[PDB]
Amino acid sequence: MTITPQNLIALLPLLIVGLTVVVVMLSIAWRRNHFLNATLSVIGLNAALVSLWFVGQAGAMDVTPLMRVDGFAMLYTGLVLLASLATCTFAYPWLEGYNDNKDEFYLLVLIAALGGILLANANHLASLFLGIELISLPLFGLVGYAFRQKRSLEASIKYTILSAAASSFLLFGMALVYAQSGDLSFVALGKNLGDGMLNEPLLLAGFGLMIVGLGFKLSLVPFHLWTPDVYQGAPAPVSTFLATASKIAIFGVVMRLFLYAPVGDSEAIRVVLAIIAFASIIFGNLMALSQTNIKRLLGYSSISHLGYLLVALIALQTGEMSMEAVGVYLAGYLFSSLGAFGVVSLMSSPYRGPDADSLFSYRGLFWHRPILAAVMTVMMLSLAGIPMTLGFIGKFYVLAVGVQAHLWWLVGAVVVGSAIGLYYYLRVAVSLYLHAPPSNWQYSAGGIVVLISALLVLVLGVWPQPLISIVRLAMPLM
Amino acid sequence: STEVIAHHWAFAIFLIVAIGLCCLMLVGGWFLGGRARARSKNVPFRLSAKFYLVAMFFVIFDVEALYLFAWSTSIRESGWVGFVEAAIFIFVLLAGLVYLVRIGALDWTP
Amino acid sequence: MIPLQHGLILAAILFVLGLTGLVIRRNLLFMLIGLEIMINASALAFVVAGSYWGQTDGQVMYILAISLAAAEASIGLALLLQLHRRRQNLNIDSVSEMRG
Amino acid sequence: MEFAFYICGLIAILATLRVITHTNPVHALLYLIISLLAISGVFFSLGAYFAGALEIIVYAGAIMVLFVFVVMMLNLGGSEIEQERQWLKPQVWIGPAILSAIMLVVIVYAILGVNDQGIDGTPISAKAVGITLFGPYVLAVELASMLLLAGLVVAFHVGREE
Amino acid sequence: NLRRIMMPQTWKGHPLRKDYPARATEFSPFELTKAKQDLEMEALTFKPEEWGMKRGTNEDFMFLNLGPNHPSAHGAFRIVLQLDGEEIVDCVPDIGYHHRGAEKMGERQSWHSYIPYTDRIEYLGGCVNEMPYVLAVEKLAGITVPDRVNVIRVMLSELFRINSHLLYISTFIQDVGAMTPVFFAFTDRQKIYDLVEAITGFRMHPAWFRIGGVAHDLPRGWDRLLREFLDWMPKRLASYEKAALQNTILKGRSQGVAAYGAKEALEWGTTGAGLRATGIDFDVRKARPYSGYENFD
Amino acid sequence: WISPELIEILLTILKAVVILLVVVTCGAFMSFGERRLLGLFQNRYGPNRVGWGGSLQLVADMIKMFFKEDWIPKFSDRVIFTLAPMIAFTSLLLAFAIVPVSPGWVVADLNIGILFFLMMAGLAVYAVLFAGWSSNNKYSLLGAMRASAQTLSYEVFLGLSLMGVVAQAGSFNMTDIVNSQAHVWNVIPQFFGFITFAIAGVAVCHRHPFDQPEAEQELADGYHIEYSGMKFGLFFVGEYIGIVTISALMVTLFFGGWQGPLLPPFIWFALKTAFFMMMFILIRASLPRPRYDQVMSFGWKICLPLTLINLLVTAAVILWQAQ
Ligand SMILES: CCCCCCCCCCCCCCCCCC(=O)OC[C@H](COP(=O)(O)OCCN)OC(=O)CCCCCCCCCCCCCCCCC
Ligand SMILES: CCCCCCCCCCCCCCCCCC(=O)OC[C@H](COP(=O)(O)OCCN)OC(=O)CCCCCCCCCCCCCCCCC
Ligand SMILES: CCCCCCCCCCCCCCCCCC(=O)OC[C@H](COP(=O)(O)OCCN)OC(=O)CCCCCCCCCCCCCCCCC
Ligand SMILES: CCCCCCCCCCCCCCCCCC(=O)OC[C@H](COP(=O)(O)OCCN)OC(=O)CCCCCCCCCCCCCCCCC
């Protein structure tokens, strides 16, 4: 299919982020200016976020065989852009202490955001593969941005090797699926079968290898072991981006693939994903019980929260509000992770060497940084699914979706993992208030971002109806 | 068609005879001529990162070159739309090249 | 008159050989070499599938695959050079200080 | 046409097996180059002419040139890890070999149950690939330019000398 | 770092002392074998400290030795370079590989029989090399040469100066990369050699100047050969200029390369064209005129 | 065994063998002609005593290099050391395998064509790298690394310089490229493509002024310095065969191939190819050698953008006249 002017209007955040990449790179070629290039990057990301309004006015349409733009794509584009803007905001005071080149960071963040937007709009195996790669490779650079530090270099090496392995797994699975199906469009994956022959062995094997790649990308058990090391070793704004934008974009494209593919309602794939979700919830909660590192603990937490999201994924064809539950949960998880990782980033700013990630460094945070401690305890309550937080609204959505589809093993897993999470999240939040032995407007902007995240988490925990109505508006093509 | 199979046979014989020809000259060079020994006959008569940078730039720009190779053989039936797409591709290419030159990535001399 | 199963089997054999080389080799260069083998095998599988269906999409996916392979090889070799600079040793077991 | 396919596939398999077990890195890269040439021959036997041309031009002419370049720069000689031959010890490779054999058996069993009319080997030209690339796959082309730009920026940031 | 510069480091004695024997000692294959072994393990046991080098092997610099591999008629010598990648951070030249003991031979030959040795001090110079020696001997003897001797010696000196300059310019062009003008410049050198062979009987080392004059009178017909060379030369020189010295690749290879000013030239004893390129007008033929050079425009 | 198809099969095989033998002998006798033409350019004679006009000088060199003692360094890696001259010969020989020298006289009428030439060029840079590393000489290794980086800096735009001709022809096939030059030769519209292809073809053949073993002789860092006998002869003859192949490719891509008004088509092809071979000699005789960084900066900063702009302008012109 060709590209029309209305298709170009539906292309608007992708085009704006690409133009921002080109403009920022040419500005770096002109002169290395940290403030100017950071400002140009955040201006481009804000312009894409604003142009989402024109995208919504355009309507839902297919842009080439590769992409389909609807309310679903708009919501995930907005989430990716919000995470990228927060990542740049946290990146500037951290990069102020960086002695080497700082301007390439925003270029890499912009290209990764471009990959996130592509994954939001992806309707095709080609676009899914390209969006995953377009997220991953800038993250190879960003995780090892402070490559003189041994932890950042080790995290970069681990992430690069394992993501290349997962990409080869995903591409081999895509090739097997294409060999069975003869079409790489999402709606055709299983369409050429009938009379109860959906469980074609090559199609299932291809989807299993794609599950290997995607479950690496979503930190799902047993493709999860990279998560605490890469989360700890990466720079703290990079950890923010990797926790929010990459996970949200990859889960959104997984949502769309399982909604559109006729093989998505196969019972074998459903049982395999149920096993993966159960193991992810239980394992991610259990491994975070005895973590003295806040970044590793947040990595195991991310494993458990993606397990809850996968539980919502399993009831996609059974129930009616699986996509709405996923949208509400992902908005709440984005805000909670933005606040927690942003407090970590502000505590590690400016960059001086090793990250401030020990729990002893956050012991007694209230006595010198009271606002940051209040934000961090709000986020620990939100990630525990405590009421008057948006995390509880997401957990309630997950539980309702599981109860409707009679996924009782998954519901019990969510309850048990919630209790374990209660233990370690409360441990962090109350260690904030114990007793233990900046000065520029960009650091204040980062503090304002984490404060706004805390206020949004509390307000939408008490009053979740605006977020619920927004997510219900953002519906894909049936 | 017998013309294409004749050309396939001719191509196979060309490759085989060329490889066998260089093998035969190497064998004749090894076999012929006397050999002598000397005491110091056996005696033979850290590179910077710019080497890797140049090879890496070559690899990346060769992949973009393959994209333009695919475009250039089908320009007429891709129309002006394909021209606009390839112009965007080439502009991103030239912006990357300008960025590489301006930051000293392609400056061997200090 | 080439069965699609035979091309897919050849691609799978190359893929598992590359995965074996990725697992059993401590040296980071041989890990990257195994990664190149696996991504080349997946690209071959896409080419076989595209040739079976008479479509250009297999070769287009091959093109995207080798673009990924080139960029990933570039990044992995840069990281290998950094590891050799800061460690004088390419043993991947040495980069293990983050655990638990 | 199938003669070339089976012999090139066998050569690629054997060369890859020599790659993953070899000690000398330059020799291993040479066997990898041989396997890529054989894979290009496989591509040409299937009618994917552009894929085979790019297999030698880009994979066996750029990427492995970069690998060879890095190996020659590092001056890899009598390395301690190289001298040990730990991967040749049965207790090291017997586990991963069984794991890969199990994965191969499962994938082959899935492969053998698919519908197969055979590949006719009708040549899909580079012109048709170029038409498809700048038609339905335009966004793939532009975002692949962005992907390789990201690889360029990352590799320059990491692989600098300073 | 006060080390030997002419003799090898494992040399016994000081040859210019009056009790050191001038003549060659008996050759021995054993010492040749030993010095070959020192050459073979010179790189293996190289330490920067004995050469005056420092801060090497930082562990980023390399030490690289140059040898007798580019013989552009200058001779054999070594340079050890300390390199940061491609950049020279320090280098010392290793010389004395062309040491002939010429001053010691000056104590070994008569005043007359030393003139051929003066010829081989700077072997592209010939009678130019002969001139200061015979002038200094004539100062010792109290000899004032007549005007014809002065003009003949000036003419021979200028012919050999043109010969040496032709070799220098052509070899510079060859070193830059243009391999053609050396053939033509050596043809011009052959025209000079036609005149020099006719006058002195020899090509490169004429040994023709004498204490008190020159060895013979000018042969009849010298002016014809001089006129032929003076007609031949200017078109060839203009052709070399246009073909090579005005090429922008040669200019980009040579302009701004190894630049120094007047102070650096003065502090290192640089003379000739290297000194005068810094703007210092110091030529001996004008500042301290000799051999009747003051009568020439 | 009497059938027209079988007779045509041996006719095509015999034509391919004739093309191969003529190309190899033309490369060797062009080493000899390089000596003679440098003599012509430098007001001298060159070799004119061994045979009539020096015509047996090549045979004397071949006998001398055959009966020179075969030497492999003991600390060298034998397989790679032996393999590098084989690639330096065969890469540009098989690149010639696509060149149509006359209507009906072609070895392989491939659908890829200059793509096959690009494949062969990549294998040629492998020959240089292998020769440098296998000699177990760190100077040869450094010189081969510099030569290979130069070769990559020009191979990065070699194919892009050919893409304007490909775009005008609308095909990768070499005979279609010739037939598209039936009215106007490609040197007029693809002039910048012609000059960039000529520069890149000289550079990938390691000819002056891109010859690394002659560029830096004081460092003694040439990657040929451990080769001797028939392996050095393989390097020499492969370099001259590469010059012949690059000249023939330039003739068939920018100068109409075999097309001409009066003479037979092979006569026109041979005359144009011999003219470009002679221009290779004159380039060697006349131009000085730029610095290494200057050469690579010229390749990256000037020639590659020129090829990209030339391709874009060629496409705009082609679509403009496509009414
Ligand atoms: C310093 C500079 C600062 C600049 C400002 C930065 C912050 C503010 C950013 C504002 C972004 C605005 C985006 C607006 C998107 C919706 C636009 C719109 O009009 O949507 C309406 C459309 C359905 O309505 P209608 O127009 O009738 O549809 C016709 C098409 N069939 O609706 C749709 O089709 C779908 C509607 C929902 C799509 C998702 C919403 C956008 C992304 C939100 C991400 C965050 C969500 C979670 C937080 C919510 C908090 C309340
Ligand atoms: C020391 C030895 C190392 C190894 C050297 C090589 C080993 C093998 C030698 C024997 C080769 C036998 C002949 C191969 C087949 C030739 C014919 C052929 O390829 O035909 C297929 C195809 C036809 O295309 P076309 O004419 O357009 O037809 C359209 C529809 N019929 O045409 C094509 O598909 C053309 C494209 C493929 C051409 C491949 C040519 C060889 C490539 C490898 C070069 C190796 C160089 C030396 C080693 C490098 C370093 C290892
Ligand atoms: C001889 C016994 C074995 C000896 C040791 C191994 C030597 C090398 C063996 C592999 C290479 C040669 C394989 C045989 C090719 C013979 C030609 C052939 O099969 O042609 C058929 C077909 C022609 O094309 P098409 O138009 O489709 O015709 C179909 C029939 N009308 O052809 C095609 O479609 C494709 C033609 C082949 C592809 C091009 C050549 C690829 C060469 C890859 C070499 C890899 C490295 C080898 C290293 C060897 C040493 C380890
Ligand atoms: C059959 C094969 C031959 C076919 C004939 C046509 C093609 C010839 C191919 C020859 C290739 C040689 C390439 C040489 C490139 C040199 C570029 C370079 O680095 O030049 C450096 C020089 C100065 O650079 P800069 O940085 O300014 O230095 C200042 C520092 N002091 O910068 C300069 O001097 C600027 C100009 C550089 C050279 C421009 C290109 C000249 C190409 C050669 C002349 C060809 C003329 C036509 C021949 C007849 C054709 C029928």
Ligand SMILES: CCCCCCCCCCCCCCCCCCCC
């Ligand atoms: C210094 C630490 C080195 C760690 C090496 C890790 C190697 C792992 C090898 C795993 C082998 C698995 C063998 C098959 C297991 C059973 C089948 C799969 C599970 C059902």
Ligand SMILES: CCCCCCCCCCCCCCCCCCCC
């Ligand atoms: C440098 C030139 C290399 C050429 C290699 C191939 C030579 C092939 C010779 C073919 C001769 C016959 C051509 C067809 C007939 C037309 C010409 C007749 C008179 C020769």
Ligand SMILES: CCCCCCCCCCCCCC
């Ligand atoms: C660790 C979590 C344990 C949860 C146990 C849930 C058991 C559900 C059993 C459902 C049986 C349904 C029979 C029809």
